[PDB]
Design a protein around this ligand. Sequence first.
Ligand code: GLA
Length: 305
Amino acid sequence: NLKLGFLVKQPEEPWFQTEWKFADKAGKDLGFEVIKIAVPDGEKTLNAIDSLAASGAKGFVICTPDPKLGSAIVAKARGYDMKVIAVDDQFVNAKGKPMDTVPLVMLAATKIGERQGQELYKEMQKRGWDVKESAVMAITANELDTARRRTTGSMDALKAAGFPEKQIYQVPTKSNDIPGAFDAANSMLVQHPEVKHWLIVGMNDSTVLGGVRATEGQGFKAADIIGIGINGVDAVSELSKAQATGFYGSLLPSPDVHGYKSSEMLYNWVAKDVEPPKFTEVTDVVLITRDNFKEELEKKGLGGK
Ligand SMILES: OC[C@H]1O[C@H](O)[C@H](O)[C@@H](O)[C@H]1O
């Protein structure tokens, strides 16, 4: 009967496919239909809302492709008497300040970035690298707050553990995917021939994977590269390879919580005018590596299948 939308900026990522699967579970448990729409740019985003209105949807969960679309999304929704919940990426106003009025469910970005930096440093220590010939490559997406809090948290943790500040090189990526990060990393690598071992910092698996791919192209072997992604589910094809690579592991948060909980809160809101909390921060995280990924995914219910 009741129809609710679930709009995601990147349907190609397992992260978002997983949110969609758990949204469907909430739909089965509470009695609603989930309309799954891909919104990779702003145009499609606004058109998709129009489409939801025509289908008679009462609201939607959205991971916007652009935080700065916040105002427009809210205006359009209001126009159609639709409730909106943001997942993963927070809406911001024209000045870049957070739109605290839209309920949000997101991960603990700073805490998870710090964990990434802690685990990089620990693995570096395990390998015995000389810090003098080591460097950090931080691939950044500073226009996205959640991305920025992860990479800053990671660099802060490295600096706190003793990694020399002057050997931390930042490079912006134009797209949050393997091609964008590949290009970024490739430009930094040729600027630093003196480096023999790289730590690769990025806000998610694809970003780190593009960095790792670039290092392979510049003649670095796996032993001399450590990249730890974030998302978990996006790293399974890499961790499943026969041979080890510079991609050492991934921090697995809870996309299942993001998908179900945002959908459940939307339903309660639409069906009972039960007002969601403004901010829901999911703190769950576990390091998955070649040795435990299958066991940890099955144990979280996102099973190696
Ligand atoms: O909330 C986590 C989520 O954050 C952003 O949306 C990223 O683009 C996704 O890949 C995922 O890491």
